[PDB]
């Protein structure tokens, strides 16, 4: 699970490892230095290394000469199972067999690295709990490492002597880590994994249990600008630490995989988790590529740009979920490729989509978006009428993110108040194209900002933790580091607008 990702590796280091440590079928994946936000899948095949291009323009991972995916870990899972499916130009089959593991601990949640022994014991005392651990570089003995563990009863600033922090020295020696005796490990990860399964036990009996890492991403909203500064030396280790937790998220997507449903997916392999998918109720198909997103009151439906065949389903869902606000974050066409089919009538025009009937009551033009007031009803029963407000965001660039977050903010702000003005309104429908990159970007910003707007500029927000929570509910939510950074930029910008 993700040991096959090497984050700080050159194309030439890539081939060396594959030729010197590898064998045919061995492979690794790595981030492109030439086209940032793009990646590369390297497979030792026939004594040689072939490299395979993967692009992410912020919507999905496009495997060059393959299919589109939501995450690298879904990508890899797919081809170590649907075999013979990965082929080069000329038909030959590319075999993904042996993950070539990376030994870089930097991306581990529990690895800090350069950190003082005193600054660490503060973190553990202050924010730590029983079984809270961390691994840092040794100042004392350079090149070696130190593992620190809190063990006790309660958490926080305690004086009852019921808790304590214990420090174990980890020696790097001939390129293998050990804790002074016993087995020598190939990586930091392997040592830590070992001692989580098999805790170290102090002579006098204390069990050095490795329960959770120490959170270092949660921050007080008020100080966001200082952390923005810290990370712009940070932002990269932070994004990548988050990216490695995507392997815990390989939940099932069987409904999406059914034959009857394959043409209801924009991208055949980008599918809604079974356990959070939207299930259509009232001889009828129950499938739509849409997930409920719940912060963890207000909730979201993260979905895709409609297809010609799924327009009627979109409206069934909207009616079923009592959604009264839709957020569209894509043009119908971008870069000449179609992104969403027009699921709404022209201004003043009444349309039927299956049993669902929709009137475009009024449009409204604004700098950054178009607002459409739609009246949805069910055919037959003239009492099912409800107003659905469609916020169409016009000004998101074809490539990358907006250079300034103000449009997005003024948009979500207005969306927020529409929702709030309607009692019992259902989840807020959000969609782009594949409904994962832009859609997740928007939803996450809206969540973080709903927290601030409530609790105030004096509260705790944790961006990576929040993004992780959202990804556990729909694959790949928030696609790029560009998008990540933008989320920071936009929350910051939202504080500085509040305190002014």
Swiss-Prot record:
Domain SH2 per the UniProt entry, residue ranges: 4-100, 110-214
Domain Tyrosine-protein phosphatase: 235-490
Subcellular location: Cytoplasm; Nucleus
PROSITE patterns, alphabetized: SH2, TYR_PHOSPHATASE_1, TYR_PHOSPHATASE_2, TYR_PHOSPHATASE_PTP
Xref: SUPFAM superfamilies: (Phosphotyrosine protein) phosphatases II (SSF52799), SH2 domain (SSF55550)
Entry GO terms, CC: cytoplasm; cytosol; mitochondrion; nucleoplasm; nucleus; protein-containing complex
Record annotation: effect of changing residue 74 to K: In JMML; increases protein tyrosine phosphatase activity against CDC73
Recorded consequence of changing residue 291 to S: In NS1; some patients also manifest giant cell lesions of bone and soft tissue
Gene3D superfamilies according to UniProt: Protein tyrosine phosphatase superfamily (3.90.190.10), SH2 domain (3.30.505.10)
PANTHER family (alphabetical): TYROSINE-PROTEIN PHOSPHATASE NON-RECEPTOR TYPE 11
UniProt name for this protein: Tyrosine-protein phosphatase non-receptor type 11
Source organism (scientific name): Homo sapiens (Human)
Protein's gene: PTPN11
């Amino acid at each position: 699970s993700r040991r096959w990702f090497h984050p700080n590796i050159t194309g030439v280091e890539a081939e060396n490892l594959l030729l010197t440590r590898g064998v045919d079928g061995s492979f690794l994946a790595r981030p492109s230095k030439s086209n940032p936000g793009d990646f590369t899948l390297s497979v030792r095949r026939n004594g040689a290394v072939t490299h395979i291009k993967i692009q992410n323009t912020g919507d999905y991972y496009d495997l060059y000469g393959g299919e589109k995916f939501a995450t690298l870990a879904e990508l890899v899972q797919y081809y170590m199972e649907h075999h013979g499916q990965l082929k080069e130009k000329n038909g030959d089959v590319i075999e993904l067999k042996y993950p070539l593991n990376c030994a870089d601990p930097t991306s581990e949640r529990w690895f800090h690295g350069h950190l003082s022994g005193k600054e660490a014991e503060k973190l553990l005392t202050e924010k730590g709990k029983h079984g809270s651990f961390l691994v840092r570089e040794s100042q004392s003995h350079p090149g070696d490492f130190v593992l620190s563990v809190r063990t006790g009863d309660d958490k926080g600033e305690s004086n009852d002597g019921k808790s304590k922090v214990t420090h174990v020295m980890i020696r790097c020696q001939e390129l293998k880590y050990d804790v002074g005796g016993g087995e020598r490990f190939d990586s930091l990860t392997d040592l830590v994994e070992h001692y989580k399964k098999n805790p170290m036990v102090e002579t006098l009996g204390t069990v050095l249990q490795l329960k959770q890492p120490l959170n270092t991403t949660r921050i007080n909203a008020a100080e966001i600008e200082s952390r923005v500064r810290e990370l712009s030396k940070g932002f990269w280790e932070e994004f990548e630490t988050l990216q490695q937790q995507e392997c815990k998220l390989l939940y099932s997507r069987k409904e999406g995989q059914r034959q009857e449903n394959k043409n209801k997916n924009r991208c055949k392999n980008i599918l809604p988790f079974d356990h959070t998918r939207v299930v259509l109720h009232d001889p009828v198909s129950d499938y739509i590529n849409a997930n409920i997103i719940m912060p963890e009151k207000k909730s979201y439906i993260a979905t895709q740009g409609c297809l010609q065949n799924t327009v009627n389903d979109f409206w069934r869902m909207v009616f079923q979920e009592n959604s009264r606000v839709i957020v569209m974050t894509t043009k119908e066409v971008e870069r000449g490729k179609s992104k969403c089919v027009k699921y709404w009538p022209d201004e003043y025009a009444l349309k039927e989509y299956g049993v669902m009937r929709v009137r475009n009551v009024k449009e409204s033009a604004a700098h950054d978006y178009t607002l459409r007031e739609l009246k949805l009803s069910k055919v037959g029963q003239g009492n099912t009428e409800r107003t659905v407000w469609q916020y169409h965001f016009r000004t998101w660039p074809d490539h990358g993110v907006p250079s300034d977050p103000g449009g997005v903010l003024d948009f979500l702000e207005e969306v927020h108040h529409k929702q709030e003005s309607i009692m019992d309104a259902g989840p807020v429908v959000v969609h782009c194209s594949a409904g994962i990159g832009r859609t997740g970007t928007f939803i996450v910003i809206d969540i973080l900002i709903d927290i601030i707007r409530e609790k105030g500029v004096d509260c705790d927000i944790d961006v990576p933790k929040t993004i992780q929570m959202v990804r556990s509910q729909r694959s790949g939510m928030v696609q790029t580091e560009a998008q990540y950074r933008f989320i920071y930029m936009a929350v910051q910008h939202y504080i500085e607008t509040l305190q002014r």
